[PDB]
Symmetry: C5
Subunit: 271 residues, 5 copies
Amino acid sequence: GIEVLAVRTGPDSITEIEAYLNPRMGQPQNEDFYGFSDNVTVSDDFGSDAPPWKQFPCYSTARISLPMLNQDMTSDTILMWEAISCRTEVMGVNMLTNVHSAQKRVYENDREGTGIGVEGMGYHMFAIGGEPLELQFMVFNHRATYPAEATVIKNPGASSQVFDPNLKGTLTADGVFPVEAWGPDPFKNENTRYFGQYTGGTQTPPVLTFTNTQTTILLDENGVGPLCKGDGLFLSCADIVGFFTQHNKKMSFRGLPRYFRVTLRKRVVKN
Amino acid sequence: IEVLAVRTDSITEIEAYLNPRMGQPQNEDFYGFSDNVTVSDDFGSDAPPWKQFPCYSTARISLPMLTILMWEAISCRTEVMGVNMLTNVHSAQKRVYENDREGTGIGVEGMGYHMFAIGGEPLELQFMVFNHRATYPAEATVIKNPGASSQVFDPNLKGTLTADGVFPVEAWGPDPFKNENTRYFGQYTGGTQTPPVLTFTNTQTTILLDENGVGPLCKGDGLFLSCADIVGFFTQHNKKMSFRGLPRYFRVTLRKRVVK
Amino acid sequence: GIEVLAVRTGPDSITEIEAYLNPRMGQPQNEDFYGFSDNVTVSDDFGSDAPPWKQFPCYSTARISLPMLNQDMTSDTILMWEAISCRTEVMGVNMLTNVHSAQKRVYENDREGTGIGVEGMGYHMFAIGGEPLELQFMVFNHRATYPAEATVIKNPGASSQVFDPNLKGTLTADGVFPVEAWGPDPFKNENTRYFGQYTGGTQTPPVLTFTNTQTTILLDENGVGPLCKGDGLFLSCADIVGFFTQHNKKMSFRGLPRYFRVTLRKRVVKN
Amino acid sequence: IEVLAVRTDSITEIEAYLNPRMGQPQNEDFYGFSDNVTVSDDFGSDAPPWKQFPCYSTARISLPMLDTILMWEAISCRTEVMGVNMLTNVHSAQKRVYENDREGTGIGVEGMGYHMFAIGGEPLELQFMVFNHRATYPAEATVIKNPGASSQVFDPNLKGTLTADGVFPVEAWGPDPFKNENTRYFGQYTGGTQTPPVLTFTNTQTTILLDENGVGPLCKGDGLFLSCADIVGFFTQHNKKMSFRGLPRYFRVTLRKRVVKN
Amino acid sequence: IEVLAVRDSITEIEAYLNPRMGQPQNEDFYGFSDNVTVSDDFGSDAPPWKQFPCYSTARISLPMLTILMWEAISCRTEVMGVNMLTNVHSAQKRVYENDREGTGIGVEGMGYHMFAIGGEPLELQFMVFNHRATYPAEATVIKNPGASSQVFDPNLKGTLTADGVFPVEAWGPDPFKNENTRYFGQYTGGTQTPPVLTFTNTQTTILLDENGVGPLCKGDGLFLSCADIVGFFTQHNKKMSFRGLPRYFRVTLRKRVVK
Ligand SMILES: CC(=O)N[C@H]1[C@H](O[C@H]2[C@@H](O)[C@@H](CO)O[C@H](O[C@@H]3[C@H](O)[C@@H](O)[C@H](O)O[C@@H]3CO)[C@@H]2O)O[C@H](CO)[C@H](O)[C@@H]1O
Ligand SMILES: CC(=O)N[C@H]1[C@H](O[C@H]2[C@@H](O)[C@@H](CO)O[C@H](O[C@@H]3[C@H](O)[C@@H](O)[C@H](O)O[C@@H]3CO)[C@@H]2O)O[C@H](CO)[C@H](O)[C@@H]1O
Ligand SMILES: CC(=O)N[C@H]1[C@H](O[C@@H]2[C@@H](O)[C@@H](O)O[C@H](CO)[C@@H]2O)O[C@H](CO)[C@H](O)[C@@H]1O
Ligand SMILES: CC(=O)N[C@H]1[C@H](O[C@@H]2[C@@H](O)[C@@H](O)O[C@H](CO)[C@@H]2O)O[C@H](CO)[C@H](O)[C@@H]1O
Ligand SMILES: [K+]
Ligand SMILES: [K+]
Ligand SMILES: [K+]
Ligand SMILES: [K+]
Ligand SMILES: [K+]
Ligand SMILES: [Mg+2]
Ligand SMILES: [Mg+2]
Ligand SMILES: [Mg+2]
Ligand SMILES: [Mg+2]
Ligand SMILES: [Mg+2]
């Protein structure tokens, strides 16, 4: 319900922020497995499914405080920051050339060859908005009991295995909304742009690109970018690269951090 | 229909979801899945049990009440929702190293079949089957005794998608000889261990205007949405496999069109 | 050597035709395995190679009779139908979601899993022309003895395993020109547009798309579409989806029919 | 060459084919194939026999005879790998999908695709570069002898030109990006041995050969130089012996008369 | 740098960087790593020198020329020697090893292809798979980098100032810096992945930023960097080594007036 008016265009009308989101794969920060999940355990049935904390990835999010542009918030019009473009890069793609660190080998029976490296599912998504990303709760198995550390809808019922219009949330906190339990809500997010790709498998080769030359335009079909409510820019992502497999065949998620550059301009809006 | 001028009050937007109809009933523990797939020994004794195969999803959306005016669908967004759930490799899945009782679950793998249709009347179907001798269950809507020509194109074997969750995906497809008033789109990747590849964004708008600049015209002020979204197979520890589906989001923008 | 003159415009100037071509994978029409080849047998050497009839696919073709637009064919100029655009779709893709019909199972040793469905090579091609598709004879093994039912160059010699400028033909008949022995001739086909893709393997997943929204322009670099000599529109195709594998490991080609919509306009030509 | 006005019968089109040179002799039963590939135990005793490895195809096309002089300028091309249809053959003496059961189709052609072509007004300029510098190439092949360890990466001394058909090994020579000012080249490599081959064909694709300055290859000696290599994969026999399989390439080239300073 | 107008005025350079996969130049395995060994745990992880690839880099001296600077406006780049990967006879594990039959498997596995063109050294972010890895003395790394180095730590910076000693697995381009460099990278992982490479002399990449300004060559130096891991070479005894290829650079520069 924001009435959008004129773009401002002077030499001081554009700002740029840069930010990083570290991955939240499960293992705690400042400890030896930071960037990984704990070794994944698998239930015998849907009824007894209770994934332990640290064994599954959660979304990354941050609110970036922008310069406050309005001396008087009672004026007939105010300025808001409008996100018009971004650059985003998955960082540390270089580290995936490591095939020597405690990895199951290509020829395990012969105790020979390189490590198999990271392989399996890729889940890469990011979102840029003027308010938190709007979520739809949806799970593979509704009878999964998520641990206390996680933010989920408890006892969500059978309808949560597909679309249930009751089961909404917002990405309000870093490292607690499980990736497997929440996704972007296309019924909402009028003030956010999101982008995602899933490549499944457990032996799938990761495919990643990185360049500082690619800009994505964030303007909608009315030429309006995300408008930063309360001078807040919301960045969200998940970057599951695949799995790390140990000699003893235990497997963990590996994630990478994401870079964001967002170019914003001053937009007059009705107040 | 004699189509005259675009009117300009004059624009409306609708949003809808279609849940998948993979075979297991709603409001029960396996909703979103088929029942475990059984395989016949030969084409002559081929009776796929009810709940073991996916069916099309469909709905008619009631549009606001209205020479006549008709709602003309000019653009859409669509999205397969719940892609996020496929990051689950812990729920009762055959493991990567089953012989060692070790590794993640293998997750959902195998065939992707993704189709959607938006029109001003029900989707017109062409009946076509892998094996014409398959005996479909009573619950399913099929052409009985369709004959050998139903394994390829037979101009006689027509239908319309009039009901949700009963038209088998494996027996019906969009009819390219009809559907002048519907746009449809479909992608198929086969296999049983194929990596699923799904994308999601809110930045993709598809224009529904034909070559004459005319969108689907909503007969009886009804907008017809149809889809099927098979994501792949769920494999249990005991190697039983079932279809897994996901729900689809629709946004359609419509405008008032004057017609004769 | 047709001298092309003015395009006719106006409400009488365009016609649209729709047609289907059923696949010719080997098994006879109106019998239980229509849409399939017979089970593929494999030779022990190139010298003894003699593929039986029904075991290999052939090209589909039709000549569509167009409205006869000229009352007098002796006039200094006549009208010809000129194909300017087409839509084409592989029909029946829906059927490949069948993994229950007598298929080798994913876990055959456990008698468990879905069927493996249709997997392996995809060969998809179509042509639209004002005359028969012009062909180049070319074979994997020149010593192959084709059955009497098939149209081939007999005793073609070693040069037929690569390009031999002598080994020309035209796609004059339906369901008899083996796919594996004939391909489009890029030296000819001035009045035909053809398009093809091959994806090999026997375990390769089929990849097919279908929509009623995709139009292919058929005008050449001079703005001239295929001109229908004698009011005949030539449609050709092959749509090998992959193989059907039985429980006993016998394998057969599976094909699908193709839809054509062709938009034609009246073109004046010299006569 | 100082380039002046386009003098545009100012236009000519040529068509040609280059048969592959996979190793087995022409006019004999395995034409299009290599001989069955043998693998060495180590880099120090590595001598790939003649016929077991592919070589580049090349031809010079004689064009219509012609202060300043006229030269033919190639402005566009079509090219096509022909015979893609033959790869639907899964019956000709092929290892079977279920060999232990003596059942299934043949496995067909699978493995690496190496597809390159070049169109120039002089021979394609080459850079010598090899997997293993100690490989002993056969007498039939054109190689740099004793090329040194440098030749496993870039060495500026190790140059050649593609002057003859069917004798420059693909695995020892590639296009030189430091040269080829008067040639356009294009290449694609997909590796492996069981990789699915992917090939397309159409007569609706034309490639523009003009450079940044709007000049196409100028045909020195009124000669048009066509080169290629089209490895589609490996043929596997019942006894697991493997051989390269190649396909011929079509070229159409449109040329116009260009005035140049003599 | 305050950038004024585009100012005889154009120059072109060509260069190659040979790969630094680990085995020494002018010896029989130039282009390869040594055979890769694998640790039993993250705690005892000490990759020997020559078993892992490092970045290649060179500074190109530009012609002697408010001030004027050289501004890189376009490049061509190509991975050379793609032709050599058609070799399936040179001491490779056979397709049917049990039968001592078939071609060699050739080069297979991970592709890492990155290049950068700049007016100063490439700015690096340190990031490693396993922070407890002990890199050998020959390598340039951050010693005892801590758990934060397994993801993004803003304290863990370098610049690519030396050829063949910055491990690819420890350094990547820093998106927080590199305002005067253009970098491009693609990774495809796995150990049995088919390599996919293209080559042509018909592709030119524009190096101008959103303000129409290319890399400005500080001290009249042009900085070229790359890593081109094509995949692994597998011997009959299943030992595996990195295989790299050299990269070609063409760069077009123009004279630019700056304050
Ligand atoms: C053991 C197992 O995996 N059970 C799963 C169950 O499979 C059975 C089910 O698919 C039925 C059809 O509804 O078919 C088979 O059971 C038959 C018979 O129908 C049943 O009554 C008897 O118990 O055993 C028979 C042979 O097993 C399948 O085993 O399916 C459910 C979903 O419907 C769950 O997946 C359950 O884990
Ligand atoms: C058995 C078989 O597959 N035969 C095929 C034949 O393979 C031989 C061929 O590749 C030659 C080199 O020209 O090498 C091997 O044969 C050697 C020797 O050269 C030969 O004279 C002797 O009889 O056998 C030896 C091996 O023990 C290969 O077996 O090659 C042709 C193609 O050239 C056919 O593929 C034939 O089926
Ligand atoms: C023996 C081994 O691989 N140990 C792992 C260790 O695995 C643990 C698992 O065996 C079980 O005991 O649960 C705990 C939960 O924290 C561990 O997952 O995990 C650590 C990293 O967490 C490391 O991978 C060891 O090598
Ligand atoms: C037992 C079996 O799988 N039968 C197949 C049948 O195979 C036949 C083959 O075994 C041999 O006898 O030759 C004939 C040639 O016409 C058959 O190929 O084939 C039919 C299909 O025609 C069917 O697949 C049976 O199940
Ligand atoms: K930006
Ligand atoms: K819309
Ligand atoms: K024969
Ligand atoms: K041409
Ligand atoms: K350049
Ligand atoms: Mg909404
Ligand atoms: Mg119609
Ligand atoms: Mg011709
Ligand atoms: Mg040069
Ligand atoms: Mg910066």
